[PDB]
């Protein structure tokens, strides 16, 4: 994906875990993958690993999540032969001044 | 290289990432290339990654 908006894009994906190694057998039919992403300014490679970590919310399995910020004109690569969870919905912003999150119940007006 | 400078040197390095695997095979022979870096305090492998970045 090129970036052609002139606002830095925000792109998240993600990698799984499975619990199991018939899990990732089953799913992606390697023994072993590898997740590339490479952009400008950022660049990485993943490995799933293959873990019985507790039971959370009804699953064993895990997925890490990644986030990017694509610069105008630039271009961001993915490359999977398995375990990638893959982006379907960027995000063209443009930041402002620096504020926070209040962690508040009270009504808005 | 051994430090006898009895200062701290800055050494710098770095890792080309060709645009095809065409390239990669030209210039070094090899599908997959290593490049580890290792001190007393410092120690990082690298990796090629092949891509057709922008130009």
Do not use: C
């Not at 993600?14 to 072993?32: C, F, M, S, T, W």
């Not at 590339?36 to 690993?49: A, G, I, M, Q």
């Amino acid at each position: 994906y090129a970036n052609n908006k002139e606002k830095e894009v925000l792109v998240l994906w993600g990698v799984h875990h499975p619990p199991n190694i018939g899990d990732q057998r089953a799913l992606y039919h390697k023994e072993n993958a590898y997740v590339s992403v490479v952009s400008s300014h950022y660049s990485r490679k993943f490995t799933p690993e293959i873990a019985k970590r507790p039971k959370v919310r009804d699953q064993e399995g895990r997925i890490n999540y990644y986030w990017t910020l694509l610069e105008p004109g630039d271009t961001i690569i993915f490359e999977a032969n398995g375990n990638l969870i893959a982006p379907r919905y960027a995000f063209a912003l443009s930041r402002g001044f620096g504020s926070g999150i209040i962690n508040s119940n009270a009504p808005m007006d």
